[PDB]
Amino acid sequence: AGWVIGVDPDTSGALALLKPNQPPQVFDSPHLKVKRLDAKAIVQLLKSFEAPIGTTVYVEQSTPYPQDGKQGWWSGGFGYGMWIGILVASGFSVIPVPSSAWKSEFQLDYSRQVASQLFPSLSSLLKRKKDHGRAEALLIAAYGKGIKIN
Amino acid sequence: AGWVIGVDPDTSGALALLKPNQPPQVFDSPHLKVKRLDAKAIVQLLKSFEAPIGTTVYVEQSTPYPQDGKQGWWSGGFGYGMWIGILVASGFSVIPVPSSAWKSEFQLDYSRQVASQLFPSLSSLLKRKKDHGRAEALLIAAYGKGIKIN
């Protein structure tokens, strides 16, 4: 049983969980009740999976807008660093993934429609512009599952 | 048995471990073999402590030089985020601490000499300018231990 997790580490990102012979699942990244990721709630979400130790997690490499201030670059690195630290500390095998990696394999901005096509049972969850993070997480997971025959 | 850990999260930072009725200890933050923190080695160091769950960890709030580029602010946030994520994921109780907090309680740049005075048995480890991170980690731990009678 080889699970694959895909993570969009942005503050409006998400986590996708793909288990073999099971429908896909996706989870909005929890935020504090202050736009800020909630490390405690991320840890608890991950722990609730009871995933096999060493389960592979693919994390999109955060790259910031060219037009972002100094606290904006600090914030993107903080969130990416928090996810890496959480995942490595939780026993997962962590593979950073440039956004170009999955965007290239899936014709890619159409990520929401592309995710709906690959994961029809989740299309209701990708209808709105806010669902971009859910879409990226699913595509990253799909990418990390690889091309494989039965 | 109430342990206190102090962490300077900078790339040349360090971790200080204070146990009751034991001499203090300090550890350079491990780096990759590429200036880059090594998340796997940080996790393993923390796990090797076998600390009580919920042990309190005080982490200096990373603030970057005003004169630092966009990748420089991204790097300081990444390292601070990685430490927070590692510590929360590892079950510790994490308290961020402004540098002003301990600098104010210990007359504070003289942190290396101040650390040597408070922790004489470690003064050999604070002799060089490279030992700044060790000094800050110890001061943060001393600060987090609090003022308390026997």
Numbering used by the authors:
A (entry chain A), B (entry chain A): 109 to 142, 150 to 223, 231 to 272
Authors' description from the paper:
MOC1 exhibits dimerization and an RNaseH fold, belonging to the retroviral integrase superfamily. Residue D183 from the BR loop recognizes the cytosine, determining the cytosine-dependent HJ resolution.
The β-sheets are flanked by six α helices (α1 and α2 on one side, and α3, α4, α5 and α6 on the other side). The α-helix 2 (α2) from each protomer constitutes a helical bundle, where G192, G196, G200, and A204 form a hydrophobic patch on the dimer interface. A structural homolog search by Dali40 revealed that NtMOC1 has the highest structural similarity with RuvC resolvase. NtMOC1 in the complex also exhibits dimerization, and the HJ is embedded into the cleft of the dimeric NtMOC1. Structural alignment of the apo NtMOC1 with HJ-bound NtMOC1 revealed minor conformational changes with an RMSD value of 0.527 Å over 242 Cα, which mainly arose from the loop preceding α2 (we termed this loop the base recognition loop (BR loop), discussed below). Mutation of Y180 (Y180A) has little effect on HJ binding and resolution activity.
